[PDB]
Amino acid sequence: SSIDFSSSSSENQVSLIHEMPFGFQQVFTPGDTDNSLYLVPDYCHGGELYIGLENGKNLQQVTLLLQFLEGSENPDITDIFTGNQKIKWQYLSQNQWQDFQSGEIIQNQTPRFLKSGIFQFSIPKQANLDNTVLPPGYHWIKASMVKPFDVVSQLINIHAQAVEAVFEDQGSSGNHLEKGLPAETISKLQERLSWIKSIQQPYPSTKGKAQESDEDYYRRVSERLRHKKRAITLWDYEHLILQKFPKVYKVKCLNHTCSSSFQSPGNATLILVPDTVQQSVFDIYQPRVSQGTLNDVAAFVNELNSFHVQAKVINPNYEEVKVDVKVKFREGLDVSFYLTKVKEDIKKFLSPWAYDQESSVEFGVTLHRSQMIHYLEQLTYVDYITDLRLLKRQAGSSPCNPIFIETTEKEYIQPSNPKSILVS
């Protein structure tokens, strides 16, 4: 048999099918002619995310919540969606991808996948449930990007049918305001209505604030009377930010620091550490500040500095050493006070410096004497012959040749910045 795919009036008796990562497509059927056939599907440079939706209808609206872990992006990329660049959206119809029309997208609060928000749209007419390039039975929607994979934040989840709501201030005590309402406290309406099967609350509430205490009132007034609302020295910068931005746990001002220098006049760098108390969301061993806060902080201070000075606001880019020790001379029991339990306690004590948590010790970045006292205080301990905490030269995951902290340091940070000395 011999087949010219471009010739009419010929018994082109062959069927051609393309194989795709999640399906297939019929390309050429017996009797057909064409002018451009390929043996393979064409995939261009970039990334694609496919979302399949169940039980919709071709003229209904869909509201989607995208919950991101804010700050979890790679800070060391130069291609970052400058200008008016953004993530593109398309829908599937008869195995083809098609652009949405202007009246079909209602809102997009997350144009570059950097912050949590809502996406809302209607299901377009001609949306199709019966397809081959992607499994049938679902409406399919595509999002795409041509940038390196880390320029966007990592996701936690995607939910349909999201609704936003807010605390009503009445004559009661808003104790839940300092640390917000915990996940899963809400399950019902005031009047339980018959048609609602159910309500869920996955994440902690946010953006609230309780009335000032006497202690805070005095603290705030007393500082203004000293710094005069100007950002001149170290204390000024550090206290202006902690008073202004309520969800910053620690701050550090660096007098001559630029990204390539620790001796450049006419500049400054500020390092911000978040609280991340709600560990249900946050990665407590890599706490990070999102772009919103990094930019708001820079704007706030640059207005108060001097005509001639701009400050930069960055994440700490944490790095740290960790302890090992002689076995405890006593324990409550092999299980009750297992070495693993001691390890967990040690991690918490250090974690409290890296991220908010309780810890009696003044700092993680301390001499073994502090560590010894922290352990000696335990109700399930008696002694330990020796201890050490060098940096993990043997950490394979982060490339080898890593600096170690062996030379009798009291857990000193590896660097002025890009270090934390708070491993956990």
Partner: protein, 217 residues
């Protein structure tokens, strides 16, 4: 005093609506709204009466969500409600048309499976939505079994008839014995017969072998 004097009592029987069939505390209760009290909220958990029930036995049917039911109350206490039965109305018609002759009775489910008793004609018919049925009919004097693929078996006054839509396979681990006054075998293409230990054709009158060509060994 009514409802032991501990609460306002509710007299007579009342009508309610079903909102939830899954009982969180395992007592086989169903949740029902009572519209004369409140027709918007979820309702309360009620016990259901059945025509037959016991330890792992009984006749079980449950109402669908939004079905209408009749409810009684133990000791006239509003929170000791019992479902006694289901109701029909013009909004939820009865599948069997009313008549003073009362000839038709039976069961019909949600998916369309029926079991109907016809007294006038002494007929019992069991049938599914896509044609699989069994019928016992005294007005015909017959039994019919028929499927959706065109296969059919009938026992009646003319004997037993079997027909197949595609093919037919008769097998036994033992012997197969056919008897009758006249045995007639026909094929529209080929006929074959074999035996691993021999074969025989015989008669007391005349044996006949014919074809356009006859071959022997």
């Amino acid at each position: 005093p009514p409802a032991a004097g501990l609460t306002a009592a509710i007299s007579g029987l009342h009508v309610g609506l079903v909102t939830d069939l899954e009982d969180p505390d395992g007592e086989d209760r169903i949740k029902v709204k009572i519209p004369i009290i409140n027709n918007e909220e979820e309702g309360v958990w009620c016990r259901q009466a059945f025509p037959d029930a016991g330890n792992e036995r009984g006749i079980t049917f449950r109402p669908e969500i939004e079905d209408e039911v009749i409810v009684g109350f133990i000791n006239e206490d509003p929170n000791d409600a019992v479902v006694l039965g289901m109701l029909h109305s013009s909004a939820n018609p009865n599948p069997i048309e009313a008549s003073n002759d009362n000839h038709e009775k039976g069961i019909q489910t949600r998916s369309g499976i029926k079991m109907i008793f016809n007294d006038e004609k002494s007929i019992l018919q069991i049938e599914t939505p896509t044609g699989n049925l069994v019928t016992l009919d005294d007005d015909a004097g017959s039994i019919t079994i028929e499927d959706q693929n065109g296969n059919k078996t009938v026992m009646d006054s003319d004997g037993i008839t079997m027909e197949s839509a595609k093919d037919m396979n008769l097998k036994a681990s033992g012997d197969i014995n056919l008897e009758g006054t006249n045995v007639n075998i026909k094929a529209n293409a080929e006929f074959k017969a074999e035996g691993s230990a021999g074969a025989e054709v015989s008669t007391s009158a005349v044996a006949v072998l014919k074809g356009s060509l006859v071959q022997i060994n």
